[PDB]
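Narrative progress, year one. The postdoctoral researcher (J.K.) led the effort to move from monomer predictions toward full complexes, under supervision of the PI. The following entry was the first complex the group processed end to end, covering 758 residues in total.
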Amino acid sequence: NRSLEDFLRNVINKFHRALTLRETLQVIVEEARIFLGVDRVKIYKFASDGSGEVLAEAVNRAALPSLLGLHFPVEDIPPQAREELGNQRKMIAVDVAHRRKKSHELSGRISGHYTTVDSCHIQYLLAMGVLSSLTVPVMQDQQLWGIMAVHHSKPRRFTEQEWETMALLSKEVSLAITQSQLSRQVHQQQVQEALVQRLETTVAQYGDRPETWQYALETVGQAVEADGAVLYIAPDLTGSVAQHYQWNLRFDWGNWLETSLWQELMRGQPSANCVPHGYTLGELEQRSDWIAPPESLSAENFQSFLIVPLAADQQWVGSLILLRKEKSLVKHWAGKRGNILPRLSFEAWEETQKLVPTWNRSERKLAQVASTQLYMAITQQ
Amino acid sequence: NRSLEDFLRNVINKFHRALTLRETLQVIVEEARIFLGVDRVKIYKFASDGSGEVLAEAVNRAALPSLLGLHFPVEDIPPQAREELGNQRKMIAVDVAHRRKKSHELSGRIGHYTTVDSCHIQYLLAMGVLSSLTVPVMQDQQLWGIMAVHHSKPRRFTEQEWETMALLSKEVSLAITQSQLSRQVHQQQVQEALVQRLETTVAQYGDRPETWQYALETVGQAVEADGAVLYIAPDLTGSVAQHYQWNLRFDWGNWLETSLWQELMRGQCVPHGYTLGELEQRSDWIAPPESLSAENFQSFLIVPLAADQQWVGSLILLRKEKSLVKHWAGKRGIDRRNILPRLSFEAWEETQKLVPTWNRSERKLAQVASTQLYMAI
Ligand SMILES: *[C@H](C)[C@H]1/C(=C/c2[nH]c(/C=C3N=C(/C=C4\NC(=O)C(CC)=C4C)C(C)=C\3CCC(=O)O)c(CCC(=O)O)c2C)NC(=O)[C@@H]1C
Ligand SMILES: *[C@H](C)[C@H]1/C(=C/c2[nH]c(/C=C3N=C(/C=C4\NC(=O)C(CC)=C4C)C(C)=C\3CCC(=O)O)c(CCC(=O)O)c2C)NC(=O)[C@@H]1C
Ligand SMILES: N[C@@H](CCC(=O)O)C(=O)O
């Protein structure tokens, strides 16, 4: 007999009333650095393409540089090393001055063997001013989420007491990542429900008037974090012209929406139940029925479209159109990357990248739930 | 630059100060029952043998009975059901009155029915249950247990409720991980505090024989043994074969000189476990007096204090037979357990006898203390 909105709030109040993920990573590296008495302890998180970022860092600035916020390319860690770190779950200790390494299991020991290090990784570590390195794999969903990096500018051997402690801290990071990922999912459930309740109240208050649909559309566009949005309402029983509503736009899509192109698009039909389908601008232009929009239309940098038909079997009543502009992202890399020899400079290199917007799992679900509500509201609930 | 003792206490203070595992399961089931408005929500944890226990429960007592603390046997949940819940991670809903079921993925979210086996139908009817939702609880990609949602009346669960239960299952899984990691850190302190306790008694209390008695009781308490034996091999040419005892009635001075224990205290500092049944079936086996066997020691953890060449002593950690009592939900038959379901789930109390084992934490701890003593004398 308790509402969902009240229930989700109780989950966070009791199970997710903690610190953020970033703040937790920061606490962990500082405790490791003090306990080890080393120059630098970092936490590095892989991206999908194998590259990564330094998310947390405790560092003696007099001894080592700060790599916080810097990105490293995929080639820095070759498949051989990733295999040993992830699938074998090996912590790796590199003794630079003697060009040797050793591996201990992240799991346990129940009881060291030295191996010669490749000359590239030796120069690499030298270029960093590092003579002692301990790489600790961070696991999540049986995958290498990233590493914990312990660096010292002087020769430094680690006792087993220190191995086990870093292995323990690795599980703490894994714990926090799990915590943060679940708290994210709960919060997405709150946003979903808050959108539904807001839409229901809007209709109950205003009814079947343009103010309802204008307010509802931009409420949805804001929840799904789009850059712009359009709600199209088809002619009802015995004809009722056509209604369209816009948010964060500049020109009237009214005439453009009546095009053969958009009538097919809004229904989710190719030829060129509220299942949202994503599109890029470059894909729509390749349609056989593609008709160019006005001049000051394509200059708004709108590149990503999420079109959701307002339908239910033999009943199509309209469509929800969510838009996203091309975004410019800045990444600071450690040295100039963009082969056989390692780079010997790790200075901050700035790069700007025009990324094509994507509609993730949560946003697509949110758009589905939103359009479903819109369908039920249009057919007079 | 920091000691280990200070570090581990900071880890617990900063990451492990919250509700216990038991308290969290009880919070979770109570929120689930109130939210769903059903008669009973339970959390059920599997043992290694396939059986399980109702750890937490929220129940409308005027609608359904209480199963809190009760054990259910392995036969109740057949291999195929464990496969669906575990490796396939299926949430299973049973509509008893129509003898049908539908399955949904624990993580899948964006409706088909199948006939339920007649046995599981009788089973749920015997419980007074007409509507059931079984949600797998995972840990390390293994089926840790289930969350059981039971209603006496027919009840179809909406999509919003499926996701919500799935979310609570992830919450349970999180609390389990936190609990286990909290246990590891605590066992790290026990191992640490043992060492510092010994070292304060080594370089300060001299080489008095009273030290080997205090270290024996300190280690014995840390490993939570019922009795401890420290055997000192003859020193140099021919000193004296000594032995210290803790919580040991009779004197094992004679039995230790036997080739039975002489071979056991030399391996063949890695700890190794033995049950009494193993010793009795040994080709090398000589019986002890009745006064020694009257204490009923069944589990032996022998840790040879040696480094290849030099073998100066051996550590023997002992545990008596344990008696565990189980409250089975209904009386189990002597045979034909997979043939017919029980129709009565009244608490049947059975006492069990078992030989205690030595887990990874205790064997690691026994190894730490043993090496600590080897370098001592
Ligand atoms: C040589 C042309 C190329 C190359 C090869 C290479 N790398 C490794 C091992 C590792 N390199 C890293 C990189 C990092 N360590 C860090 O701390 C950070 C920042 C947080 C980065 C980006 C890691 C983690 C490993 C694995 C663990 C280790 O310490 O070795 C090897 C293997 C070494 C060996 O054989 O012993 C090789 C061959 N590195 C380059 O940059 C070139 C492109
Ligand atoms: C028949 C002779 C034997 C038998 C077989 C059987 N069981 C199932 C399905 C399940 N049975 C359980 C048991 C429990 N449910 C609970 O809620 C609790 C907590 C107190 C227990 C111990 C579970 C979890 C399942 C799986 C999920 C489900 O609801 O189905 C089946 C499969 C049913 C099917 O056809 O799908 C079968 C064949 N059960 C017996 O007890 C007999 C000894
Ligand atoms: N060797 C794999 C990674 C294996 C792992 O994740 O453990 C790679 O380079 O992508």
